[PDB]
Structures are given as structure tokens and as C-alpha cells.
């Protein structure tokens, strides 16, 4: 395990921000690095709530359903019900 494994690539996170805003806008190097830290915690935060619940049923594999549960559990109802549509089109 490296050190920058706990973050997503800054240029990728930044590119999504550029698109979100108008073309005439600019984004502080600080603001990009903040977003990177945020989105990277959003992952680890939801994962941990799915991780403990999986250890109760004594699973080793963490599956998308476990993620969608963990989201509704941590009051991310909007995200859970949105990605519910992505998972259903994936699984078929």
C-alpha cells in the first residue's frame, strides 16, 4: 500500500468540477485538493458502514447491495435510490 492510495487522482476530481461549473469560471488549487479529500472520505465513510454490517453476517466479499444499504443507513437516501437504477441495469 502507497500513501496516495487513500485519495483519487486530483486531475480527475478537478475535471468533474470544471464540467459542473461554467467555462468562464476558475477553481482554486486549494479547492481542488479539498474536493479530492472530500470525495475520497465519502468512499471510505460509506465503505466502513458496509464493512461492519458484512462482518455481522460473516461475509468476506463486499457487494454493491451492501453499499446501497450503507448509503440509506447514513442518510444518503437520494444517492442509494439513484445508484439502485445503475446496479439494476448492470446485473440484468
Amino acid at each position: 500500500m502507497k500513501e496516495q492510495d487513500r485519495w483519487l487522482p486530483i486531475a480527475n476530481v478537478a475535471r468533474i468540477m470544471k464540467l459542473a461549473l461554467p467555462e468562464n469560471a476558475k477553481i482554486a488549487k486549494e479547492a481542488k485538493e479539498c474536493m479530492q479529500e472530500c470525495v475520497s472520505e465519502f468512499i471510505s465513510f460509506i465503505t466502513s458502514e458496509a464493512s461492519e454490517k458484512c462482518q455481522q453476517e460473516k461475509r468476506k466479499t463486499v457487494n454493491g447491495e451492501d453499499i446501497l444499504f450503507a448509503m440509506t443507513s447514513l442518510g444518503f437516501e437520494n444517492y442509494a435510490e439513484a445508484l439502485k437504477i445503475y446496479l439494476s441495469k448492470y446485473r440484468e
Partner: peptide, 18 residues
Amino acid sequence: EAPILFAKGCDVFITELT
């Protein structure tokens, strides 16, 4: 599956916060 969900979930997260 989970990475594939997070990929989209993070895209929509970043975009709404920004």
C-alpha cells in the same frame, strides 16, 4: 460492482458540491 457504483456516485457527488 461497488467500485462501479462509487465511480458514478462520486461523479454525481463532486458535481453537486462544486
